[PDB]
């Protein structure tokens, strides 16, 4: 007895939206709802087995509604299956952080940590396990507002059977076990990505070696800008005992307190157009 998932799946006419540019296949474009006087900036994502999986992603993405998770606007069932979502104009936080490293202050870094914890707490609320939390899967709406995305691996809660090895709890590398608490481990790796301005974790170490390194007690090192307060939070996300790791609701609180005095916790040197409507205001 779980609750009935009464989310709506919107089917969009391909005449309703005009592609504009390739971004990766993911395109950017513009969606004009049916006779409504609005233009929505949108990203658009484009065999049998593959279709089975992109519909899984659309199922999850249609079932979440939170300011820090990307929601599905709709699908389009043309000769190909397209997912339509809100355009996140600044793109990937992993790229954003590498591109502006000489320009990102402690306030932004800690606020990102809070928002990502909020998104993850919401997914935990929906008994939802992401399994691929990473800085490459956080998108940037504005520099002050990020959202978690990429739900291709999300499951509705352990688990079973390519996997992102350097972001995974040890119990997931070992037993294909996945928890909201294995997500917290991945959250820690993600925070480490942001505090190093985009370093690759265990850079140079082959994935085969990862499981034994974490078994020997080894962990990612303390980033330069990080006080022991921040780094210790990360280290707690990497406890062997999954129940010893912090809850997302607590990560929200700890990083919230730090974001009220950012410099005490991060040490960083130098602290066509009418009728356009963002998806977050088209309800
Ligand atoms: F479209 C998607 C769906 Br549907 C499901 C999952 C992910 C995506 N990717 C994106 N979503 C919204 N804005 C984006 C903006 C981007 C981008 C991807 C975006 O790539 C890099 C540069 O700028």
Domain ranges of the chain: 1-87, 88-271
Q: Is the dihedral of CA 283, 110, 132, 236 positive or negative?
A: negative
CATH code: domain 1-87 is 3.30.200.20
Q: Counting beta carbons within 10 angstroms of the beta carbon of residue 248, is it exposed (0 to 12), middle (13 to 18) or buried (19 or more)? A: buried
Q: Are 72 and 84 in contact (CB under 8 A)?
A: yes
Does 237 contact ligand 1 (Cβ within 6 A)? no
Count other C-beta atoms under 10 Å from residue 241's C-beta.
Answer: 8
Q: What is the 3-state secondary structure (H, E, C) of the chain?
A: CCCCCCCCCCECCHHHEEEEEECCCEEEEEECCCCCCCEEEEEEECCHHHHHHHHHHHHHHHCCCCCCECCEEEEEECCCEEEEEECCCCEEHHHHHHHCHHHCCHHHHHHHHHHHHHHHHHHHHCCEECCCCCHHHEEEEECCEEEECCCCCCEECCCCCCCCHHHCCHHHHHHCCCCHHHHHHHHHHHHHHHHCCCCCCCCCCCHHHHHHHHHCCCCCCCCCCECHHHHHHHHHCCCCCHHHCCCHHHHHHHHHHHHCCHHHCECCCCCCCCCECCHHHCC
User: 12: exposed, middle or buried (C-beta count within 10 Å: 0-12, 13-18, 19+)?
Assistant: buried
* Ligand 1 pocket mutation pick from 12, 86, 149, 280 by most atoms within 8 angstroms of CB: 149
Using CA atoms, how far residue 92 sits from 99, 118, 187, 272, 274, in Å, is 10, 18, 16, 26, 27
CB 91 less than 6 A from any atom of ligand 1: yes
The ligand 1 atom at the shortest distance from the C-alpha of residue 151 is 6
Question: Are 110 and 258 spatial neighbours (Cβ–Cβ below 8 Å)?
Answer: yes
Half-sphere exposure of 111 (CA within 13 A, CB side): 12
Contacts of 183 (CB under 8 A, 6+ apart): 120, 123, 124, 129, 130, 131, 133, 248
Burial of 139 (0-12, 13-18, 19+ CB in 10 A): buried
Instruction: For 111-121, give one letter per residue: b (16+ CB within 10 A) or e.
Output: bbbbbbbbbbb
Pocket flag, ligand 1, residue 121 (CB < 6 Å): no
Q: How was this structure determined?
A: X-ray
CATH number of 88-271: 1.10.510.10
């Amino acid at each position: 007895g779980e609750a009935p998932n009464q989310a709506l799946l919107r089917i969009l006419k391909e005449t309703e939206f005009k592609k504009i540019k390739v971004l990766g296949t993911v395109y950017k474009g513009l969606w004009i709802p049916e006779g409504e006087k609005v233009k929505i900036p949108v990203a658009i994502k484009e065999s049998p087995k593959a279709n089975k999986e992109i519909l899984d992603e659309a199922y999850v993405m249609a079932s979440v509604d939170n300011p820090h998770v990307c929601r599905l606007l709709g699908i389009c069932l043309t000769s190909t299956v397209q997912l339509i979502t809100q355009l996140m104009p600044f793109g990937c936080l992993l790229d954003y952080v590498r591109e502006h490293k000489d320009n990102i202050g402690s306030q932004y870094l800690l606020n990102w940590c809070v928002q990502i914890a909020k998104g993850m707490n919401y997914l935990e609320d929906r008994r939802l396990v992401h399994r691929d939390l990473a800085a490459r899967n956080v998108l940037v709406k504005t520099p002050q507002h990020v959202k978690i995305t990429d739900f291709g691996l999300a499951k509705l809660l352990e688990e079973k059977e390519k996997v992102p090895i350097k972001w995974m709890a040890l119990e997931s590398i070992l037993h294909r076990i996945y928890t909201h608490q294995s997500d917290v481990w991945s959250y820690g790796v993600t925070v480490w990505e942001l505090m190093t301005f985009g370093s690759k974790p265990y850079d140079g170490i082959p994935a085969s070696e990862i499981s034994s390194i974490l078994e020997k007690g080894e962990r990612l090192p303390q980033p330069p800008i990080c006080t022991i307060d921040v780094y210790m939070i990360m280290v707690k996300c990497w406890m062997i005992d999954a129940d010893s790791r912090p809850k997302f609701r607590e990560l929200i609180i700890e990083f919230s307190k730090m974001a009220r005095d950012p410099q005490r916790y991060l040490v960083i040197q130098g602290d066509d157009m009418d009728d356009v409507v963002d998806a977050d205001e088209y309800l």
